[PDB]
């Protein structure tokens, strides 16, 4: 069928705040992820009905992508940084649900959250 | 407006030889780009009818897919390894001509021709 609406990028219901962790999360950590050479197929939603894949959606139903985890940050849609690793852990392992282990997509994955366990590596210590 | 006939594959006229190289190209390198997911578009020549591109073969006046260097390499129809490794290349540079920096079918052939590039840094010492 369609595609989903996006995921909800800011929260008029939730209290905000500013931290060390949030900043170097959009300051640092998906600055590089964004630039890697493989992360353009995550830095947007699937779009299903381009692609002619009508079985995404079936198959993942807790979607998130980089645009959605860059908005969600610029909005304080997180109050704490777990929320927004927690996003990014759902990226990853939604690309390792919807193919195969081993398959070229997965280890574009695979590297994506190796360099992004090194940048969490360096987090700022929690306040 | 129609598409042309597609890439001969069969040479006649022309020595054939099973070499390290011409074997590797077809077992390794031409499986492993044909499985990654990003594959599809390059699978078969580009059917501009029914794609509705009528000024992709007014563009592109060397046309080239992976279903015909798979079937140039099941028929011997390469002596040296460079005529198949030319023959990925100018399926790379045509989607490149064809298209505009940042396209997704750009993005796709960028991957494709890393992969490509690095079984390539791996092909066997010529006799």
New interface residues.
């Given amino acids: 069928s369609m595609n989903p609406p996006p995921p909800e990028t800011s929260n008029p219901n939730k209290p905000k705040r500013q931290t060390n962790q949030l900043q170097y999360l959009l300051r640092v950590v998906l600055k590089t992820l964004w630039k890697h050479?493989?992360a353009?197929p995550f830095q947007q939603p699937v779009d299903a009905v381009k692609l002619n894949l009508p079985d995404y959606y079936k198959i993942i139903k807790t979607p998130m992508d980089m645009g959605t985890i860059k908005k969600r940050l610029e909005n304080n849609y997180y109050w704490n940084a777990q929320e927004c690793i927690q996003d990014f852990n759902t990226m990853f392992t939604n690309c390792y649900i919807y193919?195969k282990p081993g398959?070229?997509?997965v280890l574009?994955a695979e590297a994506l959250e190796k360099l992004f366990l090194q940048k969490i590596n360096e987090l700022p210590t929690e306040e």
Same sequence: chains 1, 2.
Avoid: E
């Fill in positions: 050479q493989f353009w193919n398959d070229d997509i574009m």
